[PDB]
Amino acid sequence: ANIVGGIEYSINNASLCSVGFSVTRGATKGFVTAGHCGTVNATARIGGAVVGTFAARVFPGNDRAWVSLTSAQTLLPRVANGSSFVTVRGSTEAAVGAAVCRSGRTTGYQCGTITAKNVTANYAEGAVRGLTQGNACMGRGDSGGSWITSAGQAQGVMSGGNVQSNGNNCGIPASQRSSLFERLQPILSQYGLSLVTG
CATH class of the missing domain: 2.40.10.10 (Trypsin-like serine proteases)
Incomplete structure (x- = not known):
């Protein structure tokens, strides 16, 4: 494959x-x-x-x-964006405030901005610390997927977020989203x- x-x-x-x-x-x-x-x-x-x-x-x-x-x-060296691709050019870590997108099999390619770093998620299995937070939406299944800037700088992998009853957080405003990735x-x-x- x-x-x-x-x-x-x-x-x-x-x-x-x-x-x-x-x-x-x-x-x-x-x-x-x-x-x-x-x-x-x-x-x-x-x-x-x-x-x-x-x-x-x-x-x-x-x-x-x-x-x-x-x-x-x-x-x-690519990330899926609909039927097209974002080329992976490096792994320069973006700062809080930067635009960033993510790619996954449930919600596809979604963009937003990085709102915070070193965030702790309290999952069913225990706490996961040091996660970066963005407000691009996501859903169950997007886990593990790419977080990358449009300029091709790979940021991390999808860890979790505040998914709603419909399984994603795309139905609430960006201001209310907490989408977390592992650096x-x-x-x-x-x-x-x-x-x-x-």
């Missing part, structure tokens, strides 16, 4: 999440995603085919993971990963 940020993948033929970013670890191909999406050794599938397994994850506390892919997979930089260094760029 072609690995693009924002696309759907399943975990152990059960839960669904979204791809964060194509990365490499030496000769090994992979993609970063959210830790709550799967446990170590869990099987990832795209288009009905096995593409790899969860190599490592930290959740809760943090919310990160990377899926180690088979060499048959095709890594791409990309600590994921890359923790697992010795290099972002695939173009």
Whole structure:
């Protein structure tokens, strides 16, 4: 399969999440995603085919993971925006106030701004600290998906947010949204990963 940020993948033929970013670890191909999406050794599938397994994850506390892919997979420096693509050009972290977008299999490509950093989320499993908050909307299933600026700077992966009864927070004003992502930089260094760029 072609690995693009924002696309759907399943975990152990059960839960669904979204791809964060194509990365490499030496000769090994992979993609970063959210830790709550799967446990170590869990099987990832795209288009009905096995593409790899969860190599490592930290959740809760943090919310990160990377899926180690088979060499048959095709890594791409891109994030889905409708039928088009946003090119991944680097991982410069944007400041509070910056515009930012996210991509996922439930709500697609959504944009907003970064409103706060170092935010704690109290999830069912425990607290996750150090998350960055934006007001682009999201929904259940967008987890693990790309957060990237229009200029191509990869920011992080979708962790969680204040989803309403309809499963997303797109039906409430941006001012009331808390959409949280796990910063990309600590994921890359923790697992010795290099972002695939173009």
